[PDB]
């Protein structure tokens, strides 16, 4: 399979890594990424609990909401971290860490 990461709209910030590996993107998670992750997961668990009370399955509903929130929050944090490493999002921290290591 031939691949090509090249985007239609070029990056407006310095490109620290054109096609960062999965584990590199995850290790690039910042405090703000974890805050987004945790907030999305917590809101999802809360919605699961509250919507589960009337059917009587608040626990399992919490688990289902938490799974949805975990997947969505991880995808959002990955989106942000990868976009920063690729230069699509403001990436002052990535540039600073890159100019030193």
């Amino acid at each position: 399979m031939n691949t090509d990461i090249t985007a239609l709209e070029k990056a407006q910030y310095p490109v620290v890594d054109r096609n960062p590996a999965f584990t590199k993107v995850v290790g690039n998670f910042s405090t703000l990424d974890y805050l987004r992750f945790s907030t999305i997961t917590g809101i999802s668990v809360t919605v699961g609990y509250l919507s589960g009370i009337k059917p009587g399955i608040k626990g399992p509903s919490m688990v289902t909401g938490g799974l949805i929130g975990l997947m969505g929050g991880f995808m959002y944090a990955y989106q942000n971290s990868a976009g920063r490493l690729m230069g699509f999002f403001p990436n002052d921290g990535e540039v600073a860490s890159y100019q030193k290591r």
Binding site: L35, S38, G42
Partner: peptide, 29 residues
């Protein structure tokens, strides 16, 4: 003395985490 409903306690923790994480998200952005 103690709240015994474990699922309710977990939901309380989740709501608190959502609130505090939202505050931090605003503050650090």
């Amino acid at each position: 003395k103690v709240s015994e409903d474990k699922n309710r306690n977990y939901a309380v923790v989740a709501g608190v985490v959502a609130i505090v994480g939202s505050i931090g998200w605003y503050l650090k952005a």
